[PDB]
Design a protein around this ligand. Structure first.
Ligand SMILES: O=C(O)[C@H]1NC(=O)[C@H](O)[C@@H](O)[C@@H]1O
Ligand SMILES: O=C(O)[C@H]1NC(=O)[C@H](O)[C@@H](O)[C@@H]1O
Lengths: 577, 576
């Protein structure tokens, strides 16, 4: 809100320079950096790639598992021509929390490790000179920020992250970093909302600028031809014979937002958008007025060595694999992803359930937690609302939902979410088993219900899989009898599966068991009319905390971590065709 | 060269903007792009990451194995302020060959897929506007360019690459791309050479500019303090109490090259360098006049999904692994790597044998020789000022037993010498069929690099005792020749499947990799003139598929995702 979430672009009015590359880096186990002038430069740094997670480069346990304060630094030359523009550092994210310094000055701090951090360096920037940026980061886990966990202290004074969530505590500067220059009066935010009118469409819009000058809004088609133009910060663009953004058949217009000074332009922002509606009608999910059944995966930002580090190559391979399975959807489990993921989903016509990092929520630390949760929700929706791919918000993964105070908590979150989404698209959360139909008090808040279920894995696995199926149908029969008249989507179901572990008859952990488990789940899904989607857990094997239940991370991937299909991948491909 | 090889920097005089990201991409199997005006924009593109190899993104064989012409496109806004500068597109590489277009206009073409391509767009660039770059690329293999191979045409006309080399034919825009702006009179090239004088050092230099104005050269220490200053395009910097760049103990000065016209500076180029000397004395490799024993690996630019795509993360993990093994050296098998690898070797104090892509080696030889010398010129001009680069490898397993080969390589070594201001050691890696009795080219080398697989390709497994005997036999022959030069083993290894265990060991098991290495070590240590050991390979890497390659080459000491096999600790313990 005191900054723009808009993705940076370069044109006559806006400039950008990438700060990706090798940064300087230093661990701060004694937490003395802020006390020792590290904001003016790290005393004994090593090199660290940005974007990347720092953990998997190192060869020593204490480096990989480092938990606490750690620092990044780089230097960059600022063109003289940027003088007296609004100059910002823009981090794709800072994981989990941190303070940004520039030229020795504290600029801003941010809590929440999966959304952009904007630091206004206009008054400290040195145009036509070398500038320095230093970031103090911390990756501890607690119960007043997302995602939740604890920090354990060894008798040696060493900290260890203790997640309440099933993914590895990757951290650092995991996304691209830019330094940008904006005009003194600029486009700060905008929102689009769509209506279909026969062969035509309406694009309702709102623009927020940092000034009072007039605004012109244009819409260009995919060839850059003008199809609609309008004046004012609020208005409607009429599009004749609109080419709708369709599932797995994208079409993107380009919105152009101009701030004018009479003759002259002060600012221009452009972004691709897609004309499409999403609506829940009874137990049906409708895209452009037609029912869609969601087919796909929960994913992670996870890849060998880079950790959660962003790379377009990972996006490209994953989308080719997704298409090969005939999927149409993924959920950003369990945190908003790099913006680039959504940009590409826009191009490929994929549907996204966008999820805030509200995972691991199973006292008087809740008011603070609620504040962070709402803040992350605000930032996520403000950042992602204009992607045609984003068709739902997931506002939690497996919280406590069965108490009265749980209700009041989530009422606040959903209320907040509703105020920030110009499109009021479907809002949901993923419930775990203990959110029994007879006990859960939060499912009424949801536009559709998401279930994570592991009947046949954590419950009655293996020799008991027939019992698992009965227990599954029993729970679904109870949901059915409630006649809630909402769609149900399975957002998780899967089995840990070691590539190459074959067994006849199948065993838990074998490739064959993954297939049989999936077949059983499908039989159950297909027995209930109100089921409207299936997102398997997980697209690919991914890193978790070490332990006796995780064999080099989580192996419920349908693909291996290096993005190759296990036997079960074909099962999905065949079913989703 | 009609362009600069200098790594791009940003300062008052020089600007750079990264073009990395998602480009547009289209395969051109019918070879219709140029006739269809694709240089003005691709008609039906998909997105392609840059830097990356394109092959491993796709899920269809014909995409992965695509051989022929294919195209890249992107757009970029150029700041108005770049007006009146010399504006260049700079590709880390274009694999294997290509033509660069900008705003619809043909700019330049380049043959050779592992060195920078510079395209001067000064005359077509449009400052203050969106500009367009389109690259037509071809990844076919032939016998007139490096690395050598063939192109097979299937009956339907589909092309398949047929390498004469043991690595996958990755291609595309595999390294970073920039658009840059230089002053109209700029530093185009410079060379440094070092002399040790007691506790002091001399930095001899020459500078090449695109003009006639005076040049000032400064040297700054690692803190940025001035330690030497002089005038002229040729000169000598005197450094009192020089802090030498040492193996695994780097120290980097910063050279600063200024052009001036008396209203002030016109251009400024800065780069880190390390004061060190390298020479061969008898059977010793001398670094700063002290013998050094090379310990390390042949590598590849190779990583899951990205292929040869450059990423600093790969660099960081690989150097952490290298340090953990106690290595001090690697060879850029079998092509120059992205410049960033050398920059990091400079900081980490690693020694590099820099290798031109002369691997996989009639009327076609003169053309091949020209390509080979051109690549050599580009490699040496690009890499000569890295303190890490201590030697040039000018081939990997060519024919060497004929007079024809001798005349050919005489020209290559002569050219390399003329291009290298430092005149540092030159070498090449020899296959076993280059018998001590038959090879005519090893005398061209300052030290001899051998690739040997006694215990793998020769008498492996149950015959390993015979392999050791045969190995000692060959080394005894080399010994009796008393060449008085260092020998470095640049390859030795066994394919090793992670998790394949056997007692007693078998070929392909982790235990056999250990035993093979131990046997090789016993042999190395038996001969005084052996002065280095670079194992094949640092990590498992991709090859053409076939009955001899189980998902690529598994001679890695590390897995492809960079985790140690059992034999990794054998190196760690020995090199400690
Ligand atoms: O056990 C699992 O494999 C998964 N189940 C869950 O319920 C979680 O939501 C996931 O994060 C977790 O990875
Ligand atoms: O057979 C090998 O594994 C290796 N031997 C060689 O002699 C080559 O120089 C390498 O490229 C090749 O990968």
């Amino acid at each position: 809100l005191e900054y723009s979430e808009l993705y940076p672009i370069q044109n006559e009015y806006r400039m950008m320079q990438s700060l990706d590359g090798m940064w300087k880096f230093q661990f701060d186990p004694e937490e003395i950096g802020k006390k020792s002038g590290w904001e003016n430069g790290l005393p004994a740094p090593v090199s660290m790639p940005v974007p990347s997670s720092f953990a998997d480069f190192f060869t020593d346990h204490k480096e990989r598992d480092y938990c606490g304060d750690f620092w990044y630094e780089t230097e960059f030359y600022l063109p003289a021509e940027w003088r007296n523009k609004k100059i910002w550092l823009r981090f794709g994210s800072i994981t989990h929390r941190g303070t940004v310094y520039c030229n020795g000055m504290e600029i801003t701090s941010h809590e929440g490790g999966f959304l952009p951090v904007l630091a206004d360096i206009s008054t400290v920037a040195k145009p036509g000179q070398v500038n320095q940026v230093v970031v103090k980061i911390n990756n501890e886990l607690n119960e007043t920020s997302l995602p939740c966990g604890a920090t354990k202290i060894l008798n040696n004074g060493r900290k260890l992250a203790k997640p309440y969530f099933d993914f590895f505590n990757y951290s650092g500067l995991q996304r691209s970093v830019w330094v940008i220059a904006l005009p003194e009066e600029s486009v700060k935010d905008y929102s689009v909302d769509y209506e279909l009118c026969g062969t035509d469409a309406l694009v309702k819009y709102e623009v927020v600028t940092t000034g009072e000058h007039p605004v012109i809004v244009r819409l260009l088609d995919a060839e850059g031809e003008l199809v609609a133009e309008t004046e004012g910060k609020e208005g409607i663009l009429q599009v004749a014979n609109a080419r709708l953004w369709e599932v797995r058949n994208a079409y993107l217009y380009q919105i152009v937002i101009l701030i004018t000074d009479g003759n002259g332009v002060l600012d221009e922002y452009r972004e691709k958008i897609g004309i499409r509606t999403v609506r829940i009608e009874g137990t049906k999910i409708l895209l452009n007025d037609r029912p869609v059944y969601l087919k796909g995966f929960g994913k992670h930002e996870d890849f060998p060595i880079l950790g959660r580090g962003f790379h377009w190559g990972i996006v490209k391979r994953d989308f080719e694999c997704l298409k090969w399975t005939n999927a149409n959807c993924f959920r950003t489990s369990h945190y908003p992803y790099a913006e680039e993921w959504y940009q590409f989903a826009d191009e490929e016509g994929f549907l996204i359930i966008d999820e805030v990092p509200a995972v691991g929520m199973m006292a008087l630390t809740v008011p603070e937690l609620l504040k962070s949760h709402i803040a992350d929700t605000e930032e996520m929706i403000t950042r992602d609302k204009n992607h045609p791919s984003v068709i739902a918000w997931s506002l939690f993964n497996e919280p406590e939902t069965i108490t009265d105070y749980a209700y009041e908590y989530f009422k606040e979150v959903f209320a907040a979410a509703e105020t920030y989404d110009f499109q009021s698209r479907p809002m949901t959360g993923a419930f775990e088993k203990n959110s029994k139909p007879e006990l859960c008090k939060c499912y009424p808040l949801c536009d559709f219900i998401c279930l994570n279920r592991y009947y046949g894995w954590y419950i009655s696995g293996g020799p008991e899989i027939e019992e698992a199926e009965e227990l599954f149908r029993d729970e679904m029969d109870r949901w059915k009898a409630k006649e809630l008249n909402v769609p149900f989507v399975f957002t998780e179901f899967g089995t840990d599966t070691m590539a190459g572990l074959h067994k006849l008859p199948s065993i838990m952990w074998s490739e064959e068991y993954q297939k049989e488990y999936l077949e059983m789940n499908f039989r159950v899904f297909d027995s209930y009319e109100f089921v409207q989607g299936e997102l398997a857990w997980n697209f690919a094997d991914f890193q978790t905390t070490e332990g006796i239940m995780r064999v080099d991370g989580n192996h419920k991937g349908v693909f291996t971590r290096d993005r190759q299909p296990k036997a079960a991948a074909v099962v999905f491909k065949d079913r989703w065709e």
